[PDB]
Design a protein around this ligand. Structure first.
Ligand SMILES: Nc1ncnc2c1ncn2[C@@H]1O[C@H](COP(=O)(O)OP(=O)(O)O)[C@@H](O)[C@H]1O
Ligand SMILES: Nc1ncnc2c1ncn2[C@@H]1O[C@H](COP(=O)(O)OP(=O)(O)O)[C@@H](O)[C@H]1O
Lengths: 325, 325
């Protein structure tokens, strides 16, 4: 495994170079803010909207995307993946200076083919593992977000040092920056969204329903299941020292005994089989198909699931809790 | 439902009264710090150890437990439940001033019979839903922790106002303080520890194993499954606006579509049946039995599960990650 930190990365490759940040959302504003604080010359490329006005008002050298790319050596494409293909073809590819570098913040856009290698220019992924605002927090708190990187096209032979110079300027090198293919990163993102995320909430919901069906106070049921933030905190503390280690160091004897009675025995094999069924759907291409179909409806059936979800006892109870507290 | 806030509670019942905080751990130090900042006269009762020295060094009027109870009108018993029975019988019950109030921070000690009603004195539960340090943070941040309360013995007719005066002084009334029996609170605590907590980690682990078994980078697998804190953050953000609502407001279309494809369909009935099997074990008394047996070994078999857990691929991978980052 190949993991770079502050000692293995240098700010030298950015000296006298202009970085263009495309977008000024939760991702864009964080990168832009850190780069500037690290002494990197940063321009903001953005469309005529509210986000553009914010960048100008916060002192950044802000123009339309095309202008920003023309006046830049490293370009950071930090807008939604839905916009990449169009912006890439019209703004980026035509104006990208000879020997310049293009970076995306995950592999979604590269796997889709919306962003592609260009003869005479470098292309990379530099994907923080924390989305948006934390990147700004961690940085100002002397820390940084862990990140993956992949050199897609190294037509200069300078991509790696420049990629890691950005990674360092933004703070990612402090935690550490590991090498991993954009394709695998994309499949981990989708897997977290399609198996893990739903399965946590389904489980949380199952606990709520069983308590309510057994005549426990619904507001209290929801509060303990996740409403407290206690389940939230455990999973954040777990990321530091380990999930079992949280129970050992923080938990009481009555808690530890009870936890360990059911640890490794709550799930039938059926769960494992679905985790593989979900991966099949991502690697095989069955999801890539599913998604295109939703987008053709204008995400009509998605907006039904949005509204269907809020009718569920859990989301009914949540509204009743927030109102009361 | 009966939920009290700042407007429905008063600091008047604490004016010219002395509050004794038994213990100075993560719970004790937080209560003590807030009470003092709210202008309440607070004494600290503690045994001859490191925790006692900390209280004295931070300016608190600190003595042995028995002395603190004798010189107090409201007593807060904020030490481990293992110590309650002994401290109660020797220190509290013999010295508890006529018409004084005893409070515990959950129902564990009351259900066990270690803390009991006394003729001529008040007894209550005031249980914050966030354990330890957050109580201090939330307070200094102008906020407070949600809490449950139960009046066990109201021999004065003044218990409720004094309980809620403490609740307000500590900050719990800001969020809100709901009425709930100590017995139910105990069963929610144990249920969170025995079904939900294990089932989250089992699920997290299942995701990790499936990814590793399919030739994904183990360090990356663990990072995405919980190591990021992204799953942690979602469940904390979920407590604010709702778990499905987090996906709707923060998630991308590709994320939302994928999440909603598997939401409500990841778990077979077997899961629901165990959630009931776990409740049976807590209400029926089968767990109360299980626990006593572990304590007779001196928690020998628990220390085996502690060490067994750290051998699991997930906890092996966690060590490899933290070291690397
Ligand atoms: N279709 C589009 N074409 C170009 N830029 C866009 C488009 N849609 C949104 N943007 C820009 O992308 C940013 C949106 O950020 P946001 O929606 O918060 O997502 P993210 O977190 O991925 O940045 C803004 O700068 C906005 O102006
Ligand atoms: N057997 C005991 N008898 C009396 N006090 C005890 C005993 N064990 C621990 N304590 C006290 O209880 C506190 C322990 O706090 P800690 O272990 O962090 O748990 P908690 O979060 O429940 O307070 C300290 O003040 C300690 O001195």
């Amino acid at each position: 495994d190949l993991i770079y930190q502050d000692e293995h990365a240098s700010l030298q490759p950015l000296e006298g170079r202009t970085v263009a940040v495309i977008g000024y959302g939760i991702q864009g504003r964080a990168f832009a803010a850190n780069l500037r604080d690290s002494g990197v010359a940063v321009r903001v490329g953005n469309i005529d909207d509210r986000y553009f006005e914010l960048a100008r008002a916060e002192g950044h050298r802000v123009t339309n995307i095309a202008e920003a790319v023309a006046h830049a050596d490293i370009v950071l494409l930090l807008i939604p993946d839905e916009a990449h293909g169009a912006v890439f073809d019209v703004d980026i590819a035509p104006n990208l200076r000879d020997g310049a570098l293009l970076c995306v913040a995950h592999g979604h856009s590269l796997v889709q083919g919306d962003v592609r290698p260009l003869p005479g220019r470098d292309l990379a992924m530099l994907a923080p593992r924390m989305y948006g605002d934390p990147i700004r927090r961690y940085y100002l708190a002397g820390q940084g977000a862990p990140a993956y990187f992949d050199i897609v096209a190294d037509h200069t032979g300078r991509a790696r040092d420049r990629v890691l110079a950005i990674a360092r300027a933004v703070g990612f090198t402090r935690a550490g920056v590991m090498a991993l293919g954009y394709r695998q990163e994309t499949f981990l993102d989708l897997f977290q969204e399609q198996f893990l995320a739903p399965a946590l909430v389904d489980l949380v919901e199952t606990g709520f329903q069983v308590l309510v069906e057994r005549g426990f106070n619904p507001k209290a049921a929801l509060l303990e299941v996740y409403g407290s933030g206690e389940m939230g905190k455990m999973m954040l503390d777990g990321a530091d020292i380990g999930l079992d280690e949280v129970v050992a160091l923080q938990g009481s004897p009555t808690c530890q005994v009870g936890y360990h009675r059911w640890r490794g025995r709550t799930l039938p094999t059926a769960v494992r089989e679905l985790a593989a069924r979900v991966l099949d759907q991502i690697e095989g291409g069955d999801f890539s198909a599913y998604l295109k179909e939703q987008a053709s409806n204008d995400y009509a059936s998605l907006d039904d699931a949005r509204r269907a979800a809020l009718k569920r006892p859990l989301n009914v109870a949540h509204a009743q809790v927030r109102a009361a507290f």
